[PDB]
RNA sequence: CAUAAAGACCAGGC
């Protein structure tokens, strides 16, 4: 934050789509990075789960500008907030102030040359430490059409290569999250099509009896552009009814399988968790279960 | 012992500033009225 | 020898009191006229670039697989628990590369530590706190691993393939290896039996805590030994 | 109010301070107006890029 | 030793072509990003009051008692002469004291070529002509006495009294014992295996001829040496 | 070694 301050660098984080803003107050029962899990004692006072109003904090995605929006969480374990009270940060927030550069130690010399119309110098110790190391998010979109021949397929099987490029892509051809690519590896498994034409005769007749897809590629796959070296931080996945997505695939198969039925067990765990609090307050009314309602289930 | 805030010049600010999405959200809030009834711009 | 009245009978009285491993008040008496701003410019010239050390390197974490996913049982993210082992001044004494073992499940906020101490590792620092840790089964666990290097090498030309083989889950971290962080000198008078205008070098040293100030300091001073025979050969 | 609160200020008096040059490392002439400016870095475009 | 590709694999070419006491053409290749102007400052910082040297501290002349006298025989006055026995630079390699012996008669220019040579001293001028005799018997006659000291101490706090016990005719003379006189240093580049940014720091010293370049340089690179281990010890 | 068209409009740097 700046040392010195206006009073706007906080209303700016609270007022906009900045800082979240808690839809009720309640008791913080866990904190994690992606989600801010609140328990809002709707019912009578237990730490058995409660009328759970989730909060998704948009982590590491693309903006406009080629930056990341992030929102870093600072309400640690058992905190009441407030209507009104901040949650998480900004982009560029600190808890709840407006915080865009530094503070660093300035001294007004012309130093030898180099400070010449507009230049600003700076020591060894700005590039040792992270303290201006931005986020830089770079998309490469590439849409889909069709093909004279008839159109496509999914596989890995790519030509022209070598190991490391198909290395780092499955049985599928999508790279995964997560990968130290750099100038060089193949970030999307295209292969383009020869054709009868661009086919000499002689490989006319022996595609006679090879095949109908044995030589019919030839490697032209989206690569990175020369100079950038960066990793993957989300991949696309998008498919349209009619042409038979792949299986095997074992990893696409296994892996929203897996993500999904956490997705599962939570929504379950959130609606659960608001409905037999709900009826509890209205089973205590008329009777008690000391011993025999904590056994079982909250199912 | 109640004493001044001491900052930098005696402007007291008594009112904040207020919502600065004014400008967007009670024109498209007032033109389309999604929950409320039909007024006010499409209607 | 003795020789004549200049310097040879003015014996410098530069003596010891130390504190461990990170900051320490050097003192210095006598040097005649103008001999405090050469001196602790020199010996910033030399001090900044020609220092080796060992920093981290190459950071290894749990199945999170990098920077920027999540962990069940933890508050804040991967990247500011690897922002936190950044700042982590480790000492080797004569090791080329170690890894550090960590573990700690429950509740309870896992500081430099719980780190299990090994024969040649001395955490001069263990009261930094890295993150706060919950309830449900929040295991962590990390392999810290240090190598030498001196001075600012980039993430880009150094690139290391220690889990680029097959199993995959390590990427490169920017390293400052240089130790010393901060030099400041007083120029107060001294007074000794030959002459009078003497002046009393008083120095803050501070260091990272990478390699100790006196080893720090013999090897610049025999590297000074190297530079200044120079002038020497002819041609 | 600036000259009242800066003959306070640790440590220089009236905003000036002798430093000494990282390079020569002399007693510096004329006592310079030094400090912690907030400064902001500028966004890289893909015009930045080579 | 070998090290990491800094500057340990970077030979400074430092050589020698000898003019003989008096000015040296000091070439210096190769140092990197800004190291030229540092290094004439710093041993200018050094090279004009931490150096020993010998010039002229008191002369005896004949039956001419005091300064401002005339003597049968010669042009100018006795004040023009030590005037110009002032600026004559002189060299002793191991003695601390020295008495010269000069006699000359007759018509003829005597300059300090006349001066009777010692096994200690060396003149570097013999062309400096100190004044113009005459015939009718002009004998002239002086004992030029050296002594060490350093820098410039007035004549009013040293007062020495070699004759000035019962037989007088000396008084003490102000000394100039800094034998440092310019050093420029012009800051063109260079280039060696390792890096390309390095700059060729080539110097033009001027020494009066009291201490040789390679004397003074190397007392001077020995009393750096001595200086840069004052960030050594703790308390 | 060959492929990422052309054009329109907007934003941006000075």
Redesign the pocket.
């Known amino acids: 934050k700046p040392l010195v301050g206006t009073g706007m660098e906080r209303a700016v984080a609270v007022d906009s789509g900045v800082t979240a803003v808690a839809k009720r107050g309640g008791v913080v029962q866990y904190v994690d990075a992606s989600r801010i899990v609140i328990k809002v004692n709707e019912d009578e006072m237990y730490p058995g789960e409660a009328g759970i109003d989730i909060y998704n904090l948009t982590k590491y995605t693309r903006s406009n500008q080629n930056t990341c929006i992030n929102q870093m969480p600072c309400v640690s374990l058992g905190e009441p907030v407030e209507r009104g009270d901040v949650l998480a940060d900004g982009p560029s927030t600190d808890l709840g102030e407006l915080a865009l550069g530094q503070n660093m130690r300035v001294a007004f010399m012309p130093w030898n040359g180099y400070n010449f119309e507009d230049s600003i110098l700076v020591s060894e110790r700005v590039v040792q430490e992270d303290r201006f190391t931005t986020i830089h998010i770079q998309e490469l979109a ?1 849409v889909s059409r069709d093909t004279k021949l008839g159109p496509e397929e999914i596989t890995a099987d790519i030509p022209n290569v070598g190991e490391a490029a198909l290395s780092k892509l499955d049985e599928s051809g999508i790279v995964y999250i997560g990968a130290e690519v750099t100038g060089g590896d193949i970030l999307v498994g295209k292969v ?1 099509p020869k054709g009868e034409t661009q086919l000499t005769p002689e490989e006319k007749l022996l595609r006679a009896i090879f095949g109908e897809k044995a030589s019919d590629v030839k490697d ?1 796959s989206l690569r990175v552009p020369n100079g950038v070296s960066g990793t993957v931080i989300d991949v696309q996945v998008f498919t349209r009814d009619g042409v038979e997505k792949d299986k095997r695939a074992l990893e696409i198969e296994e892996m929203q399988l897996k993500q999904a039925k956490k997705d599962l067990s939570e929504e379950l765990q959130i609606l659960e968790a608001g409905l037999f609090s709900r009826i509890r307050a209205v089973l205590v009314a008329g009777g008690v279960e000391a011993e025999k309602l904590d056994k079982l289930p909250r199912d | 012992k109640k004493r001044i805030r001491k900052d930098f010049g005696k402007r007291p600010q008594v009112l904040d500033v207020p919502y600065l999405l004014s400008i967007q959200l009670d024109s498209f809030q007032k033109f389309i009225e999604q929950d409320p009834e039909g007024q006010y711009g499409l209607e | 020898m003795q020789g004549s009245v200049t310097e040879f009978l003015k014996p410098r009285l530069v003596d010891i009191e130390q504190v461990s491993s990170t900051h320490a008040k050097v003192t210095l008496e006598p040097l005649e006229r103008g001999f405090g701003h050469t001196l602790g410019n020199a010996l910033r010239r030399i001090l900044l670039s020609s220092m080796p050390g060992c920093a981290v390197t190459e950071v290894e974490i749990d199945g999170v697989l990098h920077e920027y996913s999540t962990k069940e049982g933890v508050q804040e993210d991967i990247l500011e628990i690897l922002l936190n082992l950044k700042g982590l001044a480790v000492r080797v004494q004569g090791k080329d590369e170690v890894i550090l073992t960590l573990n700690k499940s429950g509740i309870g906020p896992v500081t430099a530590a719980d780190i299990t101490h090994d024969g040649d590792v001395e955490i001069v620092k263990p009261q930094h706190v890295i993150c706060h840790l919950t309830d449900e089964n929040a295991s962590i666990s990390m392999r810290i691993k240090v190598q030498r290097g001196r001075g600012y090498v980039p993430a880009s030309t150094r690139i290391h393939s220690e889990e680029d083989e097959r199993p995959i889950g390590r990427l490169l971290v920017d390293a400052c290896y240089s130790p010393v962080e901060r030099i400041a000198y007083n120029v107060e008078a001294a007074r000794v039996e030959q002459r009078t205008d003497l002046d009393k070098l008083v120095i803050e040293m501070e260091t990272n805590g990478t390699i100790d100030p006196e080893e720090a300091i013999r090897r610049a001073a025999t590297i000074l030994a190297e530079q200044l025979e120079a002038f020497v050969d002819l041609r | 109010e600036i000259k009242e609160l800066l003959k306070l200020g640790d440590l220089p008096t009236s905003g000036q301070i002798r430093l000494y040059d990282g390079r020569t490392g002399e007693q510096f002439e004329r006592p310079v107006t030094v400090g912690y400016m907030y400064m902001l870095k500028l966004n890289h ?1 893909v ?1 930045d890029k080579m």
């Open positions: 590439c383009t032209s | 475009l015009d």
